[PDB]
Amino acid sequence: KRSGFLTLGYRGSYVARIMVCGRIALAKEVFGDTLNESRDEKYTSRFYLKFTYLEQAFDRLSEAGFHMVACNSSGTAAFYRDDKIWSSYTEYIFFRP
Amino acid sequence: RSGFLTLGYRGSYRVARIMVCGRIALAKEVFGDTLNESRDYTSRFYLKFTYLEQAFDRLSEAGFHMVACNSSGTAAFVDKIWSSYTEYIFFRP
Amino acid sequence: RSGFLTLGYRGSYVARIMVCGRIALAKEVFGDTLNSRFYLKFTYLEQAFDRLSEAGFHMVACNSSGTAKIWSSYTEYIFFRP
Amino acid sequence: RSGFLTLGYRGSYTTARIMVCGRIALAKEVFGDTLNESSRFYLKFTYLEQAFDRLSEAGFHMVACNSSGTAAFDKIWSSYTEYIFFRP
């Protein structure tokens, strides 16, 4: 089935890492040869994106017919007391009918 | 004087409740009489007459900084209707 | 699944360990509860970090403030699960 | 003669200057020429153990301790501990 979900993970710290989770057939259709599997899962796996920024991944998902459904963001900071270093991780859940 | 404060915002995209968890001394110092205990979320404390932006101003003037955060927002068929629940962790040295 | 958990306790170096967060996350991690300012509280040997570590939570922040003689401190631990 | 003094200490123990807060008369008496203007000052040629000895020999007792530590992704820890001393 061409329908399904695709989770887009982004681990940033304010060249980051972009993750793609979901069925393999859906990941290869939207992202092509930018996938890099890292198993750590039946018919689904997690991939890392090369030669692709976050905005480009959105354009690939938008043209493929996916829409953002859920978004799980979380960040933690560490300290003088005015300057902090944030380390966030966001998951954008996309779905295609 | 030092310690943590937790905010629990459950909004949509203005009728959102703001849960507060932490020491009673720090919560009373920042929010004052806007603290209320629901006699009906492990703290049962919420904020009256206070939006999320106003809660950030009270924490900033009191000397608290956002050290951690975790948001989770879903969407239903409607653009769309987004329902997000966010937990803010504030800390004052 | 995700969320924060806070463990605050007033000791004299030990009283109850108050728990902050959601009731769903509190009962999922702990088999103990109660009825600071927190409705739920755990009274144990302070080895609840294991019940938090294997459950998926990690210590992300900590703050201990004590005053004097005998010291009366109040420590707050911040745990988070992705 | 009597007053308060605070010793700020910052560290970064992943997976260290010393600050002094108080009156210039009390800070100059305890730490001599080790403190420099940053009132607030920072110490040189002095560790945390030696700073406690200078306050102990001067008559200051530790009355408060506020230790804090924040982490960020097995992570980068940023700890800040200040000791509040007082002499009658």
Side-chain angles (χ1 to χ4, degrees), chain A residues 13 76-79 85 87, chain D residues 70-73 76-78:
Chain A
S13 300
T76 170
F79 291 155
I85 302 178
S87 180
Chain D
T70 167
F73 292 144
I76 298 180
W77 277 93
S78 178

Short mmCIF file of all heavy atoms in Angstrom, two decimals, chain A residues 13 76-79 85 87, chain D residues 70-73 76-78:
data_model
loop_
_atom_site.label_atom_id
_atom_site.label_comp_id
_atom_site.label_asym_id
_atom_site.label_seq_id
_atom_site.Cartn_x
_atom_site.Cartn_y
_atom_site.Cartn_z
N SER A 13 21.54 21.11 17.72
CA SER A 13 22.21 21.68 18.89
C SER A 13 22.48 23.15 18.61
O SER A 13 23.34 23.48 17.79
CB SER A 13 23.50 20.94 19.21
OG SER A 13 23.26 19.57 19.49
N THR A 76 16.84 20.30 25.80
CA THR A 76 17.47 20.50 27.09
C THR A 76 18.65 21.45 26.93
O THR A 76 19.35 21.41 25.92
CB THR A 76 17.94 19.17 27.70
OG1 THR A 76 18.76 19.43 28.85
CG2 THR A 76 18.74 18.36 26.68
N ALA A 77 18.85 22.31 27.93
CA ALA A 77 19.89 23.33 27.88
C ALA A 77 20.89 23.12 29.01
O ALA A 77 20.61 22.43 30.00
CB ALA A 77 19.28 24.73 27.96
N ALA A 78 22.06 23.73 28.85
CA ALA A 78 23.11 23.66 29.85
C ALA A 78 23.89 24.97 29.84
O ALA A 78 24.31 25.43 28.77
CB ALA A 78 24.05 22.48 29.58
N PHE A 79 24.07 25.56 31.02
CA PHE A 79 24.80 26.81 31.14
C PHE A 79 26.29 26.63 30.86
O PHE A 79 26.96 27.55 30.39
CB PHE A 79 24.61 27.41 32.54
CG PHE A 79 23.21 27.91 32.80
CD1 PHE A 79 22.72 27.99 34.09
CD2 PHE A 79 22.39 28.29 31.75
CE1 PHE A 79 21.44 28.45 34.33
CE2 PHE A 79 21.11 28.74 31.98
CZ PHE A 79 20.63 28.82 33.27
N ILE A 85 23.50 26.38 26.03
CA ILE A 85 23.71 25.49 24.89
C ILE A 85 22.54 24.52 24.85
O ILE A 85 22.43 23.63 25.70
CB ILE A 85 25.04 24.75 24.99
CG1 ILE A 85 26.21 25.74 25.06
CG2 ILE A 85 25.21 23.81 23.80
CD1 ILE A 85 27.56 25.08 25.21
N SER A 87 20.24 21.48 23.27
CA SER A 87 20.36 20.22 22.53
C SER A 87 18.96 19.64 22.40
O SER A 87 18.45 19.01 23.33
CB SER A 87 21.31 19.25 23.23
OG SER A 87 21.41 18.03 22.51
N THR D 70 23.13 21.20 35.35
CA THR D 70 22.27 21.00 34.19
C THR D 70 23.03 20.24 33.12
O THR D 70 24.23 20.46 32.91
CB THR D 70 21.78 22.35 33.63
OG1 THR D 70 21.21 22.15 32.33
CG2 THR D 70 22.94 23.34 33.53
N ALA D 71 22.33 19.34 32.43
CA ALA D 71 22.93 18.49 31.41
C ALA D 71 22.26 18.75 30.06
O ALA D 71 21.15 19.30 29.99
CB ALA D 71 22.82 17.01 31.78
N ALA D 72 22.94 18.33 29.00
CA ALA D 72 22.43 18.49 27.65
C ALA D 72 23.11 17.47 26.74
O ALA D 72 24.34 17.38 26.73
CB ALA D 72 22.66 19.91 27.12
N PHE D 73 22.31 16.71 26.01
CA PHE D 73 22.83 15.69 25.10
C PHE D 73 23.59 16.33 23.94
O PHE D 73 23.34 16.02 22.77
CB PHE D 73 21.70 14.81 24.57
CG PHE D 73 21.07 13.94 25.61
CD1 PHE D 73 19.70 13.69 25.59
CD2 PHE D 73 21.83 13.38 26.63
CE1 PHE D 73 19.12 12.89 26.56
CE2 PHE D 73 21.25 12.58 27.59
CZ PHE D 73 19.89 12.34 27.56
N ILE D 76 26.69 16.59 28.33
CA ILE D 76 27.57 17.65 28.79
C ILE D 76 26.96 18.25 30.04
O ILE D 76 25.90 18.90 29.98
CB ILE D 76 27.79 18.71 27.70
CG1 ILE D 76 28.47 18.10 26.48
CG2 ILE D 76 28.62 19.86 28.25
CD1 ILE D 76 28.73 19.09 25.36
N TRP D 77 27.61 18.05 31.18
CA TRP D 77 27.13 18.58 32.45
C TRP D 77 27.77 19.94 32.73
O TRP D 77 28.98 20.11 32.56
CB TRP D 77 27.44 17.62 33.60
CG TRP D 77 26.43 16.53 33.75
CD1 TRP D 77 26.48 15.28 33.20
CD2 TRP D 77 25.21 16.59 34.51
NE1 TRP D 77 25.37 14.56 33.57
CE2 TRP D 77 24.58 15.34 34.37
CE3 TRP D 77 24.60 17.57 35.29
CZ2 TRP D 77 23.36 15.05 34.99
CZ3 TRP D 77 23.39 17.29 35.90
CH2 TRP D 77 22.79 16.03 35.74
N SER D 78 26.94 20.90 33.15
CA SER D 78 27.39 22.23 33.54
C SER D 78 26.94 22.46 34.98
O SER D 78 25.78 22.78 35.22
CB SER D 78 26.84 23.30 32.60
OG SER D 78 27.23 24.59 33.01
#
